[PDB]
Design a protein around this ligand. Structure first.
Ligand code: LMN
Lengths: 528, 336, 367, 96, 384, 75, 134
């Protein structure tokens, strides 16, 4: 797995296309301020442990028992995972609080309060360290998320929506003008683009290093947000909100410098204006020291290509395993809370296969160059909190075999057969809805000593799912591995196999599916 | 004087007229058979202590000279010596010869036995050299050779290309892809000692390094046998001890730099001097804003360049290396 | 293999921290009084022969893999009268200095972290009779094994514990073939409030409260040859967590864990005993035992064999131990080695434990 | 080119009418195509095929603990003979 | 790690090495500048200087036509009508086509001055179907590689990087070479290219800054597309001998075997077929050691030609072996692809680029997919 | 002269004029977490989930049998 | 000059100006380096008769590097202050008597990297270090 739930790695996203490059659902094709008209408010964060360990003034025990603010322990999400004593026992979830009815940064919509909140979007994007998904065999996007319709601070059932994931080349021009903004190049003594580029000031010089100096006056003149305006000249550009103290909606607030509950204190934690105060003792403490730049993979170049794959997840009150890429649901019955009460909880595991995108935007054909990952929430009516207890890109050592295995078919890339390969663990799939994962009889978990603590190792099986249209009479689907194994000194080859029917599908009968091992020098000419 | 020579010959008695090995060949067939030469190397090392202390006027010098000369002859493969073009003509592409020099001079020069404060003046001078000549058709003898020149065999570094072409022992192939090559290295390490005051110890050092590599292709004209060089080019490295203490203590930060202001101002002075060197004062020096070279329209490709240096000479703008390298050196050494 | 191990906070407190006891199968509750008698039985500090003693012990971890990962111990004892003694010990487990580096101009200043875990205790021992002594010890435990990152708080977790120990040592008694000596000891260890690694009362771990009961005999022949045979029994005073099920599949396990974790340490001490429908035999699986033999020549050379057996159901720590000890003038050197006999890999395998004690001050006669 | 092979060229002894006992395994179906070698396995494949003629089957299959078993632990023998002689500082012979 | 400098050198490689160690080419690469994507972002005066430039790399820069190669796999330009302005087999040069940086926007160029700016780079093309990652790539602070970070073959026109580009990095080059008395350049060097910055005005309120890009030849693009000709610039005939650094002759043995399943040093025809009849002596397959089949054994110990070779790998420190890095280079760009395909060809109906026409001996021995696909993609062709 | 750097769960080895042959990454428990016999002075991506473990041990085998040991914190 | 070379554009053809309207140069190079080192700028080493030894030194260096590829000036400036104090208290009594040897080492290193444009005021701070230790 490659972890993706680091909050500081995510930044404000560009406006996305939904179905094709010709779809103006969120005004992604607009070359004016209308490009930002559908952006609603979104905060992405990880709740600071100071809220749980040393309660700040204005935070009560009721504020910390909501299923949107409470501390998550590993033993709740992973009851079968052993943690050594003295190590990390809490799960640091990535929390995304979405306000579809509230204005996002750099949104100059004259009529935003009268618009449908479900037509808005709130999105973040991120650069990927490894870009070759084919060489790495990146198989799916896996995430454990809290059900927002079950717990103490549950959302109303009518607040259903969608979370979209985009993988590939996604534009870094967050404020679309063709120019790369970097705020360490702003300042009264700096040269700007002589005609202002529709969002504010952009430095005319070529950037060298994405870093501030330590002069507080230069910092005050430079840390002014992605629009390049210090909130006093924003009304000139963002004319529909010139009367407000923050016309661009980009002002930053430290979560300990705000009031209210935990969610309200992180509302403006992702603002790009004023988030890099020189002194760590500032009441509006920084949260970053890096200038905000429209260059996310830090190659000095702002990419404007929009060729990516689209995957989508529904967020509805009553989701079940077998649909909506759901592979597992774990129910938590009596969660102890700091206020002395108890609450219900539901963790849902999603496995979205990367090889089966729901849509394609632009000209992308393979997974050899996947540089950016974006996720945005839309379709929601009111405030919605989504807490990723886990969010990873999962790559496997077994590769799906593409190409025909039987000469009767002769049509490999057709027939609409959904062929997925994943893993089933004792640590993650002990409550799997069709069949709970258990070890085969006689198989035991390996035991090690971490530091005077006995740790049970994970027990894993390789799961292959055939769905969609289904398998033809003599067709087969297989995964393969390149090995170097000598079997001549042993007498037996042994393997455990299990077969189950898919939920909401016709029941698989005995001796209809055949499990096969094909091993040798190849899969087409020389094999047992 | 140490002299050494190595020779490797190959015996090819097991081959037919064509490139076909002889199946029925024994390893003892012609055992005491010296073959054709394949590689030949010579090395000469001469060391001299230069007894210049004979006269009692130069009895303080302790000079010492070392000369190393290396020569190599390498036979080319039959694919080169018997190359056949698609036209069917057979060309001898020749062999390769290489030369190396390692001159070294060390002088102690005791100043003993305001100028009397100097005690010792140590001078070190190293000079390496090398010459690679491909396409050299003639072979070598059992004891060596002097065919190109006796000096070349002992590292003369004097030109032999034209003489070799005239003598007719370079390749006659007109598409020869191998390059004549030369390399030179000079290193000077002067050191002096001064005792101006009884407890004031002063050491002075001067260093200069210069390395130069030249490469060219060549042909030999079928008539008159004259050597034709083709696309000669040179590269190398340079280093020299200098002094720029005059700008050492001037403040230099992100807000101010007097030396950098001098760098900016020196560009026009250097450009004007270069323009006088190019246009030799008999005409008005053309500039980028004058009547003959007006600022073009905003859509012209050269509008920005003409506007950037309006009063500079035509061939010497602010971005010319010939303009801003002397400007940089003068600004940061404190020179005018 | 290991079915339902007992989960306790700061398990490093249960590791033998001196070569002498390690070479005797990780037992010291009823062995002869020495400078290391603080982790095992402080009550015999009143039976010391030297007035003052200091000791340094080194137990390396993962010797083949890395250096500086070790458990060190420094002990000091001073018996003031012939009846009473004070002692202070410090155990420190550390990984050594670790540099936190990004590439970032590798000449840049870097932050060094030292994740560690230490316990500092002080004990007072008093002789009640001429053959019996008691001791009370107070210990402070700190754990700082976490490294501070984003969304990770590396605040140290601390706790306090008390120790109640008793040691009986008889006088020399002549028998038919030898004039041996009898020893007995008990030690109740690590009695204190739960340690919260995450600084939340809802998530707290039991201290490794332990009970050691042991007895030993000294075969003394020729006044220059001694053979001490010692036997030790150990029981953790922490409740056993629920297992496969103790009558909604995961709901029952969740409720059982909820009721198990909501148990006080004082009540957990008594809940460790019994809690089974069976008798003494069924509870014997929670008792670890150790048997040791120490040959002593001229009180200057020591040769130690030990066997330590845990029940393979919990922990799976079964091994033999070899040990040697030497005394030059006032400096004693101990070395110990471990031969594992368990399926699970022992972290102290292929490891030579070192111990070094200095004895100074007055000398006390032994009754 | 024999008709005893499938359309994919795999030979199944269980489908051979002239072979008694099939492949020797009543539980498994064994096939071979082109001289593979389990002394050096370079390519390993696990997959699902269908046997339902007029159906489109769907489902999930778990594979676990693919392993080798029953080590052939027969031993071996070796014998060495060395004759080293020296003859009066003149000769030395060493035979192995 | 290894890239041909141009399609001209790639298509000259096989013919120029027919009679090795003699090279049937007069190319002498004299100057080379290599630029990569800058992710380090470190400014130092010691690592060869601070030479950061904006770069635009064109896939089709400097390319002319090739005699036996269709234009569609020499250049990516959608239409070549009026693109070329030199004879077909002309050596690679800036003046070969309408992408010439020296003629930017003169009368009939395909580029405007907007090609010099990163912001207006796309509008700098006079044609319609130009893509931001196919026809060109852009970098804003590209770092010039130092001479210790790469080597190059000055005769065969390819480069070898010290660090491989297994990710989305962009590779761009400018180079100058000589053929006899003629000099050719393909990119823009820092000494002959446009200035990095031009400033108009006197103070920051009215000053205009123009940052100008160097025009270079693209060798590796931001996004991998195996169907573009730039993918063919990456060499696939170089093999790194594991752990080998300073290999020397008399201390290096190499053989080619066929393991199906046992190692055999010759190739047998498929049952019911035979190898092409009456082949040339340099194209024999039947009963031929695989060293001779793959053109690696034609010389004797002294590197002199021999009738059927001496049975040993031909060790030529500039052609078949990279001595300083312990690498072995085949004498053809695709030894296990087009070379063995040609040795097994029986008629003109068989085309190497059309696998449906193979004669059932090429169907089992030609590993085309290891040259037309990535290594992970070529994993799917398990029998080759 | 040897450096190991971790930026975002990615391990980066830096050796001055020394070329490595093998790399092994172990946990504090001693379990081998990663092993590569084809080191090219490149980066390494170990599985990001390690069950609360941060400290790792990197053992590098160079050209000769010299072994370089470095303790790192996986962040 | 780390690498200079001859220019093929400097030939006998009528073409004399490049794309920047500059005359072609016979010898072309990419970078020029001016390196200056006061090592030390000043070193005062003395010892008192009271066994107090002071070794103080100021070191300085400048690393100008001008690039003709982008016509930019990269300046690396460094200063270092070192103070070493040594003293020996004599016959310090705890019956137990010993000398106390006291050593103090103070260091202050400032390093700065600037990138300077010649045509306008764009001095860029690229790297820096402001360390002191005792
Ligand atoms: C601050 C922190 C601790 C520093 C304190 C230093 C004290 C050193 C004590 C040394 C020690 C243990 C050393 C082993 C432990 C080291 C382990 C280290 C491991 C590191 C990993 C034995 O060491 C003995 O070695 C003998 C050499 O053979 C010497 O004998 C000497 O030779 C001649 C002199 O030349 C002399 O004439 C002769 O009379 C000596 O016999 C002495 O050095 C000493 O007696 C202690 O034993 C004995 O030392 C004496 C003082 O000597 C101590 O008396 C007290 O000391 C102070 C009380 O605090 C008070 O002030 C003091 O009033 C009081 O009298 C007692 O304790 C006593 O029991």
């Amino acid at each position: 797995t490659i972890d993706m739930r680091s909050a500081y790695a995510w930044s404000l996203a560009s406006t996305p296309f939904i179905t094709s490059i010709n779809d103006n659902t969120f005004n992604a094709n607009s070359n004016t301020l209308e490009y930002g008209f559908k952006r609603a408010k979104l905060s992405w964060y990880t709740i600071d442990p100071v809220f749980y360990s040393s309660k700040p003034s204005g935070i009560s025990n009721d504020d910390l028992s909501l299923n949107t603010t409470r501390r998550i322990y590993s033993r709740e999400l992973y009851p079968n995972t052993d943690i050594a004593q003295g190590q990390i026992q809490v799960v640091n979830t990535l929390d995304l609080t979405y306000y579809p009815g509230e204005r996002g940064p750099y949104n100059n919509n004259p009529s935003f309060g009268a618009s449908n909140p479900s037509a808005n979007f709130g999105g973040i994007m991120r650069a990927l360290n490894s870009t070759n998904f084919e060489q790495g065999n990146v198989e799916y996007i896996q995430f454990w998320v809290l059900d927002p319709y079950v717990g103490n601070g549950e959302s109303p059932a009518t607040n259903a929506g969608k979370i979209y994931f985009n993988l590939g080349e996604i534009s870094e021009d967050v404020l679309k003008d063709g120019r790369k903004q970097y705020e360490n190049g702003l300042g009264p003594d700096q040269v700007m683009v002589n005609p202002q580029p529709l969002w504010g000031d952009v430095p005319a010089s070529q950037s060298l290093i994405y870093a501030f100096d330590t002069n507080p006056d230069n910092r005050k003149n430079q840390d002014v947000g992605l629009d390049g305006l210090p909130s006093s000249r924003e009304g000139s550009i963002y004319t529909n909100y010139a009367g407000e103290a923050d016309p661009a909606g980009d002002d930053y607030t430290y979560y300990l410098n705000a009031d209210g509950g935990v969610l309200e204190r992180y509302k403006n934690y992702n603002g790009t204006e004023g988030n890099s105060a020189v002194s760590i003792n500032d009441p509006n403490r920084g949260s970053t020291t890096l200038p905000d730049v429209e260059d996310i993979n830090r190659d000095n170049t702002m990419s404007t290509i929009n060729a990516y794959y689209e995957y989508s997840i529904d967020v509805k009150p009553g989701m079940q395993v077998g649909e909506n890429y759901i592979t597992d649901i774990r129910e938590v019955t009596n969660v102890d809370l700091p206020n002395g009460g108890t609450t219900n909880a539901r963790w849902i595991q999603f496995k979205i296969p990367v090889s089966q995108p729901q849509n394609t935007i632009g000209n992308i054909t393979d997974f050899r160059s996947i540089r950016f990952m974006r996720m945005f929430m839309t379709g929601f009516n009111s405030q919605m909190t989504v807490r990723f207890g886990a969010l990873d890109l999962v790559r496997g050592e077994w590769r799906r075999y593409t190409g025909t295995l039987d000469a009767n078919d002769q049509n490999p890339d057709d027939d609409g057969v959904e062929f997925d390969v994943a893993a089933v663990n004792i640590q993650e799939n002990g409550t799997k809805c069709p069949v709970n994962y258990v070890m085969p009889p006689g198989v035991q978990r390996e035991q090690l000593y971490n530091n005077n603590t006995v740790i049970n190792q994970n027990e894993q099986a390789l799961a292959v799912r055939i769905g969609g249209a289904g398998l033809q009479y003599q067709d087969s689907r297989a995964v393969f591995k390149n090995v170097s194994v000598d079997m001549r000194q042993y007498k037996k080859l042994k393997m455990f196999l299990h077969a189950e029917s898919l939920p909401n599908q016709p029941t698989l009968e005995d001796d209809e599916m055949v499990g096969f091992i094909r091993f040798g020098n190849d899969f087409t000419q020389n094999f047992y | 004087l140490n002299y050494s020579a190595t020779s490797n010959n190959i015996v090819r008695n097991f081959l037919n007229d064509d490139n076909s090995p002889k199946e029925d060949f024994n390893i003892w067939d012609d055992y005491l058979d010296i073959g054709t030469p394949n590689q030949h190397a010579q090395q000469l090392v001469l060391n001299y202590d230069i007894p210049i202390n004979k006269i009692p006027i130069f009895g303080f010098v302790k000079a010492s000279y070392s000369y190393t000369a290396d020569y190599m002859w390498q036979r080319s493969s039959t694919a080169f010596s018997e190359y056949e073009d698609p036209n069917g003509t057979v060309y001898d592409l020749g062999n390769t010869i290489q030369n190396s020099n390692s001159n070294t001079l060390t002088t102690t020069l005791n100043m003993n036995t305001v100028l009397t404060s100097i005690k010792n003046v140590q001078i070190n001078y190293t000079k390496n050299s090398g010459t690679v000549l491909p396409g050299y058709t003639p072979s070598v003898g059992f004891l060596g050779t002097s065919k190109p020149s006796l000096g070349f065999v002992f590292g003369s570094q004097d030109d032999v290309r034209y003489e070799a072409a005239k003598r007719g022992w370079l390749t006659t192939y007109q598409d020869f892809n191998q390059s004549f090559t030369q390399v030179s290295n000079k290193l000077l390490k002067v050191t002096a000692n001064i005792d101006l005051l009884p407890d004031l110890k002063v050491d002075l050092s001067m260093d200069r390094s210069y390395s130069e590599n030249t490469s060219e292709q060549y042909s030999v004209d079928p008539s008159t046998n004259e050597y034709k060089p083709l696309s000669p080019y040179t590269y190398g490295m340079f280093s020299i001890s200098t002094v720029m203490i005059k700008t050492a203590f001037s403040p230099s930060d992100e807000t101010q730099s007097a030396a950098f202001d001098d760098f900016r101002s020196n560009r026009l002075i250097i450009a004007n001097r270069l323009a006088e060197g190019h246009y030799g004062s008999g005409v008005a020096i053309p500039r980028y804003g004058d009547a003959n070279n007006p600022i073009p329209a905003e859509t012209d490709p050269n509008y920005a360049v003409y506007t950037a240096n309006q009063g500079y000479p035509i061939g010497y703008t602010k971005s010319n290396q010939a303009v801003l390298l002397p400007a940089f050196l003068a600004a940061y050494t404190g020179s005018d | 293999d290991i079915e339902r191990p007992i989960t306790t906070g700061v398990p490093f407190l249960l590791v033998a921290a001196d070569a002498r006891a390690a070479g005797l199968g990780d037992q010291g509750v009823a062995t002869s009084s020495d400078v290391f008698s603080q982790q095992w039985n402080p009550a015999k500090y009143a039976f010391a022969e030297d007035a003052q003693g200091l000791s340094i012990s080194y137990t390396p971890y993962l010797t083949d893999l890395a250096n500086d990962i070790s458990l060190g111990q420094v002990t000091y004892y001073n018996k003031i009268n012939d009846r009473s003694a004070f002692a202070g010990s410090f155990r420190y487990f550390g990984f050594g200095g670790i540099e936190l580096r990004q590439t970032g101009d590798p000449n840049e200043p870097t932050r060094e972290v030292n994740p560690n875990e230490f316990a500092l205790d002080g004990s007072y021992s008093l002789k009640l009779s001429e053959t019996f002594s008691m001791a009370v010890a107070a210990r402070y435990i700190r754990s700082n094994l976490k490294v501070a990152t984003e969304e990770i708080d590396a605040s140290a977790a601390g706790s306090f514990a008390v120790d109640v120990a008793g040691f009986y040592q008889s006088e020399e008694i002549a028998y038919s073939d030898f004039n041996g000596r009898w020893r007995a000891g008990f030690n109740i260890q690590n009695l204190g409030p739960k340690i919260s690694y995450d600084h939340d009362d809802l998530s707290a771990n039991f201290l490794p409260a332990n009970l050691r009961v042991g007895g030993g005999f000294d075969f003394i022949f020729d006044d220059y040859n001694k053979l001490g045979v010692s036997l030790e029994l150990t029981k953790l005073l922490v409740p056993t967590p629920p297992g496969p099920g103790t009558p909604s599949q995961s709901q029952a396990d969740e409720a059982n864990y909820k009721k198990y974790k909501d148990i006080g340490w004082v009540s957990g001490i008594f809940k460790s005993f019994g809690d089974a429908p069976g008798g003494f035999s069924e509870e014997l699986k929670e008792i670890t035992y150790s048997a040791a033999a120490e040959y002593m020549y001229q009180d200057a050379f020591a040769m130690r064999l030990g066997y330590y057996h845990e029940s393979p159901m919990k922990g799976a720590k079964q091994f033999f131990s070899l040990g040697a000890g030497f005394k030059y003038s006032m400096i004693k050197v101990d070395v110990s080695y471990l031969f594992s006999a368990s399926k699970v890999k022992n972290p102290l395998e292929n490891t030579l434990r070192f111990s070094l004690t200095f004895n100074f001050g007055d000398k006390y006669e032994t009754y | 080119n024999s008709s005893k092979r499938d359309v994919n060229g795999i030979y199944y002894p269980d489908n051979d009418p002239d072979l008694e006992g099939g492949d020797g395994d009543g539980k498994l179906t064994l096939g071979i195509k082109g001289n593979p070698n389990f002394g050096l396995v370079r390519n390993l494949m696990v997959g699902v095929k269908s046997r339902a003629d007029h159906k489109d089957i769907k489902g999930e299959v778990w594979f676990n603990e693919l392993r080798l078993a029953d080590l052939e632990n027969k031993g071996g023998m070796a014998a060495i003979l060395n004759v080293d002689t020296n003859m009066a500082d003149f000769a030395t012979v060493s035979a192995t | 790690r290894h890239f041909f400098l141009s399609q001209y050198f790639r298509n000259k490689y096989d013919v120029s090495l027919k009679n090795y160690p003699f090279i049937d080419s007069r190319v002498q690469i004299t100057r080379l500048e290599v630029w990569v994507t800058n992710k380090q972002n470190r400014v130092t005066t010691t690592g060869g200087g601070n030479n950061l430039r904006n770069i635009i790399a064109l896939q089709d820069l400097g390319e002319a036509q090739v005699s036996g190669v269709p234009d569609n796999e020499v250049v990516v330009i959608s239409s070549t009508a009026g693109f070329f302005n030199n004879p077909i087999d002309s050596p690679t040069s800036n003046t070969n086509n309408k992408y010439d940086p020296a003629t930017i926007g003169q009368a009939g160029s395909f580029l405007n001055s907007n090609i010099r700016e990163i912001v207006t780079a796309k509008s700098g093309f006079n044609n319609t179907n130009v893509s931001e990652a196919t026809d060109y790539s852009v970098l804003e602070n590209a770092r010039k590689l130092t001479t210790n970070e790469y080597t190059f073959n000055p005769q065969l026109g390819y480069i070898s990087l010290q660090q491989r580009l297994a990710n989305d990095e962009i590779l761009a080059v400018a180079f100058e070479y000589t053929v006899g008395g003629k000099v050719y350049q393909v990119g823009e060097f820092g000494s002959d290219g446009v200035d990095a910055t031009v400033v108009t005005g006197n103070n920051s309120s009215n000053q205009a800054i123009i940052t100008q890009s160097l025009v270079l030849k693209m060798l590796k693009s931001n996004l991998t597309n195996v169907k573009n000709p730039v993918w063919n610039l990456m060499m696939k005939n170089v093999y790194q001998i594991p752990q080998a650094y300073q290999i020397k002759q008399d201390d290096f043995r190499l053989n080619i075997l066929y393991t199906d399943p046992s190692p055999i040093n010759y190739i047998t025809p498929v049952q019911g077929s035979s190898f092409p009849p009456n082949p040339a002596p340099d194209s024999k397959v039947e009963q031929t050691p695989l060293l001779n089949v793959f053109n690696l054994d034609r010389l004797n110990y002294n590197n002199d030609p021999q009738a059927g070779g001496d049975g040993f790998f031909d060790y030529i420190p500039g052609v078949t072996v990279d001595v300083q890095n312990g690498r072995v280079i085949f004498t053809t760009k695709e030894p296990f692809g087009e070379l063995i395909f040609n040795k097994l060809q029986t008629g003109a109906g068989e085309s190497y680029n059309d696998p449906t026409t193979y004669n059932a001996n090429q169907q089992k021995y030609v590993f085309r997919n290891m040259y037309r696909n990535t290594q992970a993609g070529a994993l799917q062709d398990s029998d080759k | 002269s040897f450096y190991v750097s971790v930026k975002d769960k990615t391990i980066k080895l830096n050796s001055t004029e020394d070329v490595m042959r093998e790399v092994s990454i172990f946990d504090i428990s001693g379990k081998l977490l990663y092993n590569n016999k084809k080191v090219e002075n490149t980066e390494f991506q170990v599985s990001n989930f390690q069950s609360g473990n941060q400290v790792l041990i990197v053992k590098v085998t160079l050209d000769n049998g010299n072994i370089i040991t470095k303790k790192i914190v996986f962040n | 000059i780390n690498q200079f070379r001859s220019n093929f554009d400097y030939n006998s053809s009528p073409k004399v100006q490049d794309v920047n309207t500059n005359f072609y140069n016979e010898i072309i190079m990419s970078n020029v380096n001016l390196v200056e080192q006061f090592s030390p700028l000043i070193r005062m080493d003395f010892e008192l008769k009271s066994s107090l030894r002071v070794l103080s030194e100021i070191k300085k260096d400048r690393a100008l590097s001008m690039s003709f590829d982008n016509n930019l000036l990269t300046e690396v400036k460094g200063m270092e202050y070192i103070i070493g104090l040594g003293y020996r208290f004599k016959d310090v009594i705890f019956i137990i008597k010993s000398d106390i040897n006291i050593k103090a080492d103070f260091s202050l290193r400032n390093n700065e990297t600037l990138v300077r444009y010649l045509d306008y005021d764009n001095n860029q701070l690229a790297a820096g270090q402001n360390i002191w230790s005792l």
